[PDB]
């Protein structure tokens, strides 16, 4: 693998992909939150469920995307996914606040994004062997910057037009992504049998449960208990900014650690995440809460950026796609289950402390689980003792 030269343009295209997808998701969610700000309607419960459904479909459809990628190729599947996403996002505008919006913006957009996403992770493997960590770090950092820039691009740099045309405007991004997908030049049911991969995937899935609770409830908590604050947009901006640097440095360092020993980084990350999450209620002064948010954002990147390189390490290149597909499919449920459970706890108790207390446990349990992943040599010793 060149691990250089041309590969950079592929990295650029993948950055564009991720930035468009997650950027859109978050922007549309914020827009809906803004429409419900002053009016009961403009359906509330279903409106909230719509975004969750769209986000979930990305994780839920990964295995079938894996099959299609393996049997057709990264380029064709990526192009088809981009085309479907564009069609869905364009037609959603025609649907004027009707249940048709449910169907289109959920099914069409989610399935399109799911088709487009996984190849954006697989293709990099073909072009990087001794620097894949740095490439993934760069892709994540670029995508994060793109997402953080998207709302500035929409709200203030434009959006002089009524709300109905916002989807139409957003469509062009997916069209451009469809064009970019043509650059994925191809250079060249059984994965679960491996004990190591099974354990790792199960641990990650278990940790994933208490993941979105901070992002979804921090603002409400701060407003509830720190109304004296002028504005609380600072925390989210700071978390994103630190997450960018965390992702980049994590990708750069991951290549240093050889072999499976990379997993120890994830272990530490999880531990820190759990502790900080449990620590938010304690800190009773904003001056400390901001620092805790800083550290949370810093650990988030160290966690996210590493999953793909570890997968390639565990299963090799010829099976990375299927492993990633199954791993994402296994994360479908807990991520959705998290925030609603936190909300139920908040209703049951009233104070918001118990929500974060609960949210802090799953990552610790995940760290403990990952701590016991056997090494290859020990697998061989097991086999020997089997004979």
């Amino acid at each position: 693998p060149p691990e250089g030269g041309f590969g950079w343009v592929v990295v650029f295209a993948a950055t564009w992909c991720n930035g468009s997808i997650f950027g859109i998701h978050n922007s549309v969610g914020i827009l809906y939150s803004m429409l419900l700000e002053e009016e009961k309607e403009k359906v509330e419960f279903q409106a909230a469920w719509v975004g969750a459904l769209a986000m979930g479909m990305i994780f839920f459809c990964s295995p079938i995307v894996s099959i299609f990628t393996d049997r057709l190729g990264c380029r064709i599947t990526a192009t088809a996914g981009a085309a479907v996403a564009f069609i869905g996002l364009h037609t959603s505008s025609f649907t004027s606040s009707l249940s048709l919006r449910y169907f289109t913006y959920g099914i069409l957009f989610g399935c399109g994004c799911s088709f487009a996403f996984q190849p954006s992770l697989v293709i990099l493997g073909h072009y990087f062997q001794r620097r894949l960590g740095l490439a993934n770090g760069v892709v994540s950092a670029g995508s994060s910057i793109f997402s953080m820039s998207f709302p500035f691009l929409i709200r203030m740099l434009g959006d002089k037009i009524k709300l109905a045309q916002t989807f139409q405007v957003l469509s062009t991004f997916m069209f451009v992504l469809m064009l970019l997908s043509l650059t994925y030049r191809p250079l060249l049911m059984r994965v679960f049998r491996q004990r190591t991969y099974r354990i790792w995937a199960f641990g990650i899935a278990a940790a994933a449960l208490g993941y979105f609770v901070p992002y979804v409830h921090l603002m409400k908590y701060v407003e509830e208990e720190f109304s004296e604050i002028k504005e609380t947009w600072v925390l989210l901006v700071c978390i994103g900014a630190t997450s960018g640097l965390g992702r980049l440095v994590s990708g750069h360092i991951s290549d240093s650690i050889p072999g499976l020993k990379k997993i120890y980084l994830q272990v530490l990350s999880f531990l820190l995440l759990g502790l900080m999450s449990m620590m938010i209620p304690l800190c009773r002064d904003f001056g400390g809460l901001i620092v805790v948010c800083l550290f949370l954002g810093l650990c988030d990147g160290f966690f996210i950026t590493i999953m793909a390189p570890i997968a390639f390490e565990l299963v090799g290149p010829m099976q990375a796609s299927q492993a990633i597909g199954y791993l994402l499919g296994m994360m479908a449920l807990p991520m959705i289950a998290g925030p609603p459970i936190a909300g139920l706890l908040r209703n049951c108790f009233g104070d918001y402390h118990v929500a974060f207390y609960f949210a802090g446990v799953p990552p610790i349990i995940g760290a403990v689980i990952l701590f016991f992943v056997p090494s290859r040599l020990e697998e061989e010793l097991r086999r020997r003792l089997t004979e």
Partner: nanobody, 121 residues
Framework: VQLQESGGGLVQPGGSLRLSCTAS???????????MGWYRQAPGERRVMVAA???????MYRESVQGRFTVTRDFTNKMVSLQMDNLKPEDTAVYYC?????????????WGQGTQVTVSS
């Protein structure tokens, strides 16, 4: 890799016996990349691993002989000591020092000059 088993002989039932040898023809650094262990072979049996210590320092046993068998590893001195207690007649066999070395998508299993051990009254 060179090995020379020290210890063995006849023991009474319920007795104790300690085997140990120093890795030869291998450096400390190389050894730490290897798993030290032992092999059992009774008359007519095939040589089979019974105990070993991992790269990560973990000890692992064949559960049948666990407890009655014990292994400890001193990486500095390149020493692995196979302690055994509560010996029984079924344990009679020749035991061989072994080193497992990892290689590129492959492994190398080395053998020592085994020592006979018998358990009878």
């Amino acid at each position: 890799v060179q090995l020379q088993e020290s210890g063995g002989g006849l023991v009474q039932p319920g007795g104790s016996l300690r085997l140990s040898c120093t890795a030869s023809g291998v450096t400390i650094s190389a050894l730490n990349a290897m798993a030290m262990g032992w092999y059992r072979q009774a008359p007519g049996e095939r040589r089979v691993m019974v105990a070993a210590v991992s790269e990560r320092g973990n000890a692992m046993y064949r559960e049948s002989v666990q407890g009655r068998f014990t292994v400890t590893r001193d990486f500095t001195n390149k020493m692995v000591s196979l302690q055994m207690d509560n010996l029984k007649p079924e344990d009679t066999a020749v035991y061989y020092c072994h080193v497992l070395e990892d290689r590129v998508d492959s492994f190398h299993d080395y053998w020592g000059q085994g020592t006979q051990v018998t358990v009878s009254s």
